Amino acid sequence: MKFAVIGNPISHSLSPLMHHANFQSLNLENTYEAINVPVNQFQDIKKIISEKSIDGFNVTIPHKERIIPYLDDINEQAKSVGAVNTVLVKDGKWIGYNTDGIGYVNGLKQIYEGIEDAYILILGAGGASKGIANELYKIVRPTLTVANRTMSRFNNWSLNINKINLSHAESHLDEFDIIINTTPVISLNRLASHTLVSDIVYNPYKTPILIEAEQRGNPIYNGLDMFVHQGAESFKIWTNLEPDIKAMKNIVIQKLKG
Ligand SMILES: O=C(O)C1=C[C@@H](O)[C@@H](O)[C@H](O)C1
């Protein structure tokens, strides 16, 4: 089967390196190649893909919304986040999926015991935040809380979740078992001792919030696992097989060192 990643730029993508490691562990005769698609040539996307006989592809900067009109169908999750990172070519039909959020959430699940009873705060109300909150909503029993600087951003949200501003997150910070920053931030001055602090970025390997949270002697978690888990989730969709998460993360790490 033939896979890819589209984007502009595409050369620093670690998707092919990673999906390949997965193919070699599963003993699969797949290719996964980086495809450079400038904005100016994006209108010819159906043709760039189909001439290469592509089965499924990831979509990254700056085409995650740009791809949407070319899809024949799109899932609720993508539609909701308003962005597509995965497309399935399934008998000439293009179908758009979004695995970033489930990708972050499946990673967290592994490194956080009993996430179903977790008091989770998320910072940010934009699209990455939305995608994670949708996925959590399905597995977390206690109501989610999303904090944002502007209340209006929640108008197109769809969840029955608590929605607060940033100063109110600061002063109730100790009610939370996990905090997830999706913002590129708060005062950690009421930060409970046990609280896990997470950012969906892994370059830099630690953002300011994670730095300070670590000095306060808290557990921290960056976006590395999100990146592996979103691609693993694309792979499940495309192929109906189980990805080797350890092989995929180990190669990305080795590449990151160096
Ligand atoms: O750098 C990459 O190759 C990617 C990064 C993220 O945007 C992912 O959402 C995308 O599926 C692939």
CATH number of the domain encompassing residue 103? 3.40.50.720
DSSP assignment letter at 70:
G
The residues with which 2 forms a beta bridge, in sequence order, are: 31
Residues 91 and 138 in one domain: no
Which residues participate in the annotated binding site? 13-15, 60, 76, 85, 100, 124-128, 148-153, 200, 202, 223, 230
CA-only gyration radius of the chain, Å: 19
Burial 114-149 (b: 16+ CB within 10 A, else e): ebeebbbbbbbbebbbbbbbbbbbeebeeebbbbbe
Residues 151 and 243 in one domain: no
Residues 169 and 255 in one domain: no
- The torsion angles phi and psi of 234, rounded to 5 degrees, stand at -50, -40
Is-contact 186 173, C-beta < 8 A? yes
Query: In the sheet where 31-36 sits, what is the strand order?
Result: 31-36, 2-7, 56-59, 86-90, 93-97, 73-74
Closest CA to 123 of 73, 36, 187, 194: 187
Structure tokens at 105: 């959430």
Residues 258 and 180 in one domain: no
Structure tokens at 96: 């758009």
Q: Is 64 a catalytic residue?
A: yes
Residues 190 and 126 in one domain: yes
Residues 141 and 248 in one domain: no
Which method was it determined by? X-ray
- The torsion angles phi and psi of 6, rounded to 5 degrees, stand at -105, 150
- Which residue is catalytic, options 64, 206, 249, 255? 64
Residues 64 and 133 in one domain: no
Residues 102 and 136: their CA atoms lie apart, in Å, by: 8
- Which residues constitute the domain of residue 7? 1-98+223-258
Residues 108 and 198 in one domain: yes
Residues 197 and 117 in one domain: yes
Q: Is the CB of residue 60 below 6 angstroms from any atom belonging to ligand 1?
A: yes
Q: How many CA atoms are closer than 13 Å to the CA of 93, on its beta-carbon side?
A: 7
Residues 177 and 57: their CA atoms lie apart, in Å, by: 36
Residues 36 and 120: their CA atoms lie apart, in Å, by: 38
Residues 60 and 12 in one domain: yes
Residues 139 and 195: their CA atoms lie apart, in Å, by: 19
Closest CA to 123 of 62, 63, 201, 233: 201
Q: Is the CB of residue 15 below 6 angstroms from any atom belonging to ligand 1?
A: yes
Residues 112 and 192 in one domain: yes
